[PDB]
Design a protein around this ligand. Sequence first.
Ligand code: ADP
Ligand code: ADP
Ligand code: ADP
Ligand code: ADP
Lengths: 427, 416, 435, 426, 192
Amino acid sequence: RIERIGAHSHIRGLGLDDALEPRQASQGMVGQLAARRAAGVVLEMIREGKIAGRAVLIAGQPGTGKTAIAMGMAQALGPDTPFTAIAGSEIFSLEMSKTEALTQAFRRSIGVRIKEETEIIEGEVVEIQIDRPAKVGKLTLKTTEMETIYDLGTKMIESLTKDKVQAGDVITIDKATGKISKLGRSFTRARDYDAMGSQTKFVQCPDGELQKRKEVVHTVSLHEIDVINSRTQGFLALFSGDTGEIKSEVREQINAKVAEWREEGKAEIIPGVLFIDEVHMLDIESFSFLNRALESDMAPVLIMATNRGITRIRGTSYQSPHGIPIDLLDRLLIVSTTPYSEKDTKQILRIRCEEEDVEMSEDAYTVLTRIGLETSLRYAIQLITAASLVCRKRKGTEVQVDDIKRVYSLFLDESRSTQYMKEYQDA
Amino acid sequence: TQRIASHSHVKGLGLDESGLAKQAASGLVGQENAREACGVIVELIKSKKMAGRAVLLAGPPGTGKTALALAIAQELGSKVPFCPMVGSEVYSTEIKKTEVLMENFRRAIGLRIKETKEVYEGEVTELTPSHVIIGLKTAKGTKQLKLDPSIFESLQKERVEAGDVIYIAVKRQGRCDTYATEFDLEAEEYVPLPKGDVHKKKEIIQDVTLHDLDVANARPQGGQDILSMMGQLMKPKKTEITDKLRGEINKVVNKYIDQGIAELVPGVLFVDEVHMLDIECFTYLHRALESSIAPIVIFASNRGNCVIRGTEDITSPHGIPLDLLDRVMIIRTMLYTPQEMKQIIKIRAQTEGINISEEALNHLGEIGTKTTLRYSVQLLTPANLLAKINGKDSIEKEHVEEISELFYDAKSSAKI
Amino acid sequence: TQRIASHSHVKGLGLDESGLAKQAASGLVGQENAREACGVIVELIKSKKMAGRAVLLAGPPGTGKTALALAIAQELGSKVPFCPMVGSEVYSTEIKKTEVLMENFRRAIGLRIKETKEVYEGEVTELTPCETENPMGGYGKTISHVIIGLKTAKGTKQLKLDPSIFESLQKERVEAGDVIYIEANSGAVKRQGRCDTYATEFDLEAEEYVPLPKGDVHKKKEIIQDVTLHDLDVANARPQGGQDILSMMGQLMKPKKTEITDKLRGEINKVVNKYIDQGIAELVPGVLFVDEVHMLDIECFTYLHRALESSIAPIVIFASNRGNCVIRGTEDITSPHGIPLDLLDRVMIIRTMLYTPQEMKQIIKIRAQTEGINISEEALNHLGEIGTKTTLRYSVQLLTPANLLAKINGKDSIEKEHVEEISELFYDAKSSAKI
Amino acid sequence: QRIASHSHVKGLGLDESGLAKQAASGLVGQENAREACGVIVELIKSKKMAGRAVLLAGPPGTGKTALALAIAQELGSKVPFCPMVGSEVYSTEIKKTEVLMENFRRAIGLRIKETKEVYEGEVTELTPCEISHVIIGLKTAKGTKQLKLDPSIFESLQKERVEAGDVIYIEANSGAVKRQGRCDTYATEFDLEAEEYVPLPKGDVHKKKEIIQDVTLHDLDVANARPQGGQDILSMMGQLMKPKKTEITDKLRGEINKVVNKYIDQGIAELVPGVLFVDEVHMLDIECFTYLHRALESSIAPIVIFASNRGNCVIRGTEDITSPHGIPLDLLDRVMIIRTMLYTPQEMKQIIKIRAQTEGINISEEALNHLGEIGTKTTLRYSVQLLTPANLLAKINGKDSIEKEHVEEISELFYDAKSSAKILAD
Amino acid sequence: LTLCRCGESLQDVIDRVAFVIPPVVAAPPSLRVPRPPPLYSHRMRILRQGLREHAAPYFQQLRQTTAPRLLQFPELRLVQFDSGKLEALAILLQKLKSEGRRVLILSQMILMLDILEMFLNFHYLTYVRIDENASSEQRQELMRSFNRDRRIFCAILSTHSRTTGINLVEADTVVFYDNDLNPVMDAKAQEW
Ligand SMILES: Nc1ncnc2c1ncn2[C@@H]1O[C@H](COP(=O)(O)OP(=O)(O)O)[C@@H](O)[C@H]1O
Ligand SMILES: Nc1ncnc2c1ncn2[C@@H]1O[C@H](COP(=O)(O)OP(=O)(O)O)[C@@H](O)[C@H]1O
Ligand SMILES: Nc1ncnc2c1ncn2[C@@H]1O[C@H](COP(=O)(O)OP(=O)(O)O)[C@@H](O)[C@H]1O
Ligand SMILES: Nc1ncnc2c1ncn2[C@@H]1O[C@H](COP(=O)(O)OP(=O)(O)O)[C@@H](O)[C@H]1O
């Protein structure tokens, strides 16, 4: 519950209507109807997943809400669909090539819902009488509507001895493997032992004696390749990034078995999204790889964001729009974000204030909207926070003009920093 | 259903009996000379006589060189391996670059080997022990096998009532014998008694590539000696040596071949984005193509006359040096006309599952010939979604117009 | 050993109750607006309401940016963690730059985890009161309870524990006369060792005899452990327990610091939230002071202005000393403070003016005081004058050598002659430029 | 013998008075550089100085490497001589500075004087008594006795699969090994056991001899850079990086130096400083020259001979700084520079004749003149290279010696750098 | 602490690792072995000493040795999914067991009997198979074991034997999995 509000916490989805009509202000967003409708339609395409290898480029001036609309789409997509957010400079690893990192990122945003039929027996253990030779045992499971006694085997008795199960424990035994899983207790333990005090759990299902076809959908991403590349996979799946596995017999074989599962009804493919923020940092080799990697059937939807116009492509000398080669730039379609006006800026500032739980006068809102239209929006939020803190220190109830104007001089913007920078501190 | 891809519409070259390139067939359209050259190339591949040859599918962007190579692969068939590669793939941080290209050349080649495996299955009746005289029982009969100690099982593998299946080089405890009536609740699950004979030999025609054997003999993981387990305990790697690469492997493969044990299956290696490879890659490819054991390689370049990477001083056509560019045949693909653009747009819409009206198709073809064909191809799906939202089953001109208004092409974004 | 560091006089921002700035601000002098901004941002940190916020301590060299940084750090107190980092440390040959930055961000975040355990200890006197066989079945011999006579230094208290634990008692060598470590819920017995009262001087053995427990038998030990999120990341990264990890050749290379985002985020964050909302731990976000931020590559800034966008990112205090300079890793891309113009928009710039000659004199005097050497009025005036001429940091470095020269010359206080001689024996770079 | 490029150089060619003869010991001319070489070789033989540097500077093909090999030969195999190349410093698993320090350490050698004795004995007489005391029998071709050993030797012996009738070597201080069979294993007619047998050893049952093993400090460092084996720490598999990344100097090299000094004071060890010949010095980076001009100043640095072929050029790693000999002025100073002069046509012909005599090729008078002319035309190395195929063709054509026709034909067949560049303009 | 190692909500890590293991090594051979016709005693002795030293720490056991996978057997689910008849049979048997009625499964092919055996094992339904291989007395013994034994749920018959030995019925529920439409077979089959 203790998680602080970040720069994109004010947004909590992409405000859209039944007909995908964008709204002025909803779900923490304001203005920018065109790019928001583009986000809505690409999100509909993602949730459809019928087509693979689609790319979208979010372009615009800084502070136009590129990362904002990206996080909004991520939120609107909701759980059950992977959304791999990554920065352009994260692919540069000292233990795995750029192409390998891109393959990892692509396969990481693809999920397979594996269906598994289970048969679990549950109930209340009324009698767990076990005859230890130092071989024979019987279990008396009880439910709210029926009871049954089961003769325990040697291995089952040993498993029960492993996980201590006293009378009155709510357990869920899997008839397939016999794994002992304790859920709780139905009553106290004799009220006499001067220890082991806990709370009592609710009774089990009436038909819990034998659940026939308990369906559990195990969801896992296509990053499962780490499970095969090495005999010990937890080390690679948890921390180790040195996963330069062999592409042959791993990628192709896993894809083939995933197709077999999809055809045989075991699992279903759920393509996610790969959001590369500041994609301009990718080397030209990474762009050349994305050009071809984006053509596979397992290719997720590649959302990208650029904050530049004509700029040199990293790893070469010639320039291209958005710092992306002409090929990949032409392949994808671009979503331009128009700057926000004064009203939109004021509304965004008000939404941020509401998020931060801070209140300020109308004149404060006006002067702060002015300052934000002049300097920037993020700087306006910084001033919101600073003025709220100055007001709290001042013992006031709401932020007045005298606090925003004070923190404006206390904290400087880059435009004024460079102005006072004429002291030639260093070069 | 299977999700659509970028090149899932191409099914093959779609040539006539004499190789005549039809206007449109097998998903492809246009590029008659290119598709005829590709027919000749697949004939070469099927010949399985020449080795080390290569071809360059150099052409302007959007001509379909990649889709063309994928159609070539489809036409060739799944038997002959077709290894796709990106120029950036060669750049690795654990294996040498030229060695990456070498292992690619190797995996590109296929090999179909035949082997007879003796399998021992049945419920274990006796497990008395170095050599272990195990007893397997099946519906046919019982046999006391004089198995070797190397197969002695470490895990539970109960002495009795355990169903085991062994083959000569690991054992698999299938499941517990069908004693479900002995106990009412037991952790172990049961399977029926195997009906097949204990000792059975089955011939499996397995298809593998030469690089599989290469990397396997490089760092084997079989055997039972402790030194082996300690060697393969952690950090697998690459960079097989040339002496083991050639020599022993080629000799054993030729042995299997001339003895009827295996059958060589030459494949293809599609090195895409060759225009951005370093000069070292080209210098190694010089000798690679000039080898009696190198497979066919299909290159797909997109750049024109540009500076070769790794030198940043000298320029050459197609970003490939002249000495190499001459070693590979050139396939010149031309740009599609607005009519062909509209035709391929309609083909993709049919494959992609989208219904488009005549006016909508015309507007899409116009937007394509104006900005880019692939741009309209990308706009196809958004228009279908807009139609669905608006309740229209088929796309109309207004839908594609609104879509274009929402999404700006690369050219328009650059104009801004 | 006091081991006076370069600048240890700073003890805090020294702001008045009203939040304004004063001269004697707990060691640090001058820099009114800068210290007020430091107070505002430290109040922000204490609020623990905002995350991913960065501040830039831009200012010419010698303005004491690191000084005020350590001041605000001390003001925060040892309670919240403070991870100092320099731009050069990001360049690692084994782990990528962005992952080092993320590890530093994690270190900057603290987390106090409490743990209360009810345990019983004392000299055991085992005895099983015979009880009639299970009344539900037939007859025979059973045990319904097992009484353990735990004897502690304060007294004795018999515990009628559950009989099922008898297996644990027999498992370990729990004989009458030894100290056992009982657990309330688990019940597992862990023998500490025999009582020292029986440790005869003639018995040769160690680690087997332990003193009697002091206090009541029932002890509710409350312990708190403060570990940063990076500590938990590292702990959950590497394995432990068998699995042939004892190998030397193929395992001694412990520097596998490479980390993935799935483990870093996700499960760890969820378990942290579970411990927080359950009452087992309390999150404590700290601060990440990054001096020489201009030394980072553009591949580092492009990841910084994305990590700062996360809700979990802590407060970062950048301190750039250079001016308009080309960004590292870029082709003649000049930007203010050597930082891309895109990141400067996300940081609050706290400008620091140059110290007034009077402030120079105050700094020299307080540094001399901290060093513990008396300086005459004339010597202090000469030190202030030379600190006005050249860089101020040169004067403070002339105190200890001048002090030693004075002590060796037979005098206690630093006379003007001593500083005059040291200025000719040692000089600054501005004068050394005369090649 | 597989005559090499510097085989005829079997010495430096200095007389008793120290002057360099006009032509002797395989060398011809170059009296000044030969005198400098004969002075620095005496400097090295003095064994008193340390870290002194030398630079054999001069145009290409002047014999600087020949002079280095002559110095090495004159010094003799009793002192280490490490032939080193600049490109070798660019290691992938060890830093350049560390490779340079390892080469410096290799350039220092010490002789270990030790008198070891053995206690070979018969296993059939194995009769322990008490595990606390054991006795072994001795039966050689010259005598028979018995010995008494500490039970530790009996443990180390039973560790090996000893059998009756085997020859076992027992050292007086530590160690033991088995030799199977003493003319009794093949007698019983039992088949082989994957090992070869050996008859009983001759000589006395107890032997003693003086031992002198030439070991260098780098060997000690490498041996101390590992756990030495023994217990579970003995784990060793393929790919083991025996040349580990680096080894600290204060706590590892310092201890080696201390123990060496101790054993020298005790008279057990004798130090013999060697020479470090670093060829193609211009290939080293500036960050290597800066550490080299400082490491050779230590009290333990040996004599280092340098050789810079190319003249003034840009220093490696700088791209802007240019210094003579491709070496910075910092390292250039403090290094005695020995200038090598070019050879005259008569000296070239004499060197060609010496090469022909050494390699076994026989050349005629007119043939020698033509070969010397072809050499002075472009370079002596071209004539040295053409000398062999000339005699090869002569043998093919049935001629024992080389004539004008054969030399002219082989010169027209192949081409030199000058000729190649002349025709390369096409 | 405990982690999920994946995106699933909650599940045993062992189950996670056991579910997804598609690939097996393509062609792993044994290790290379130098073959010098003479083997010097020194190297062989050193190698034997090394093997003995490595075998001494056996207390670890390498946790099953983590041996590679080389078989990749087919999933048991495919037995049912491969045929809708078996899915309908699963539904019917689940219904009948929820009702408590035994089942008498009738099939014609012995291979189909093995298929039904694997299917019931997938459903954990205890069964007793009576086929032609078992002699008349063995068939009667199997029928007697099925009768009066409420722990046995299903009974599988071949429908091609005489079956004149069966005497008593338990739950009066029969399932004709296969239909033969043969002249004499079906007649006497349905009759008995
Ligand atoms: N539509 C919007 N609604 C609310 N805040 C916005 C919006 N657009 C931009 N911002 C704010 O501007 C700052 C930077 O803009 P951002 O959302 O990152 O877009 P961009 O990626 O173009 O900078 C952020 O702090 C963000 O909160
Ligand atoms: N001959 C063709 N027939 C049908 N569609 C084509 C043809 N050539 C190209 N395409 C289409 O053009 C799109 C891009 O072609 P592509 O293979 O990427 O060209 P390139 O290889 O030059 O990048 C593909 O999605 C495919 O639909
Ligand atoms: N206001 C001040 N009062 C006392 N000492 C100061 C003050 N400002 C700077 N100093 C001194 O300056 C020295 C270093 O300052 P520092 O924080 O490193 O600035 P910069 O990093 O810009 O050089 C410290 O040793 C400290 O003693
Ligand atoms: N003084 C000499 N007398 C005889 N032969 C010489 C003499 N100097 C050089 N040579 C020969 O000339 C060749 C030059 O080789 P080298 O010493 O490598 O030249 P550089 O001076 O470039 O090192 C050597 O092979 C050597 O045999």
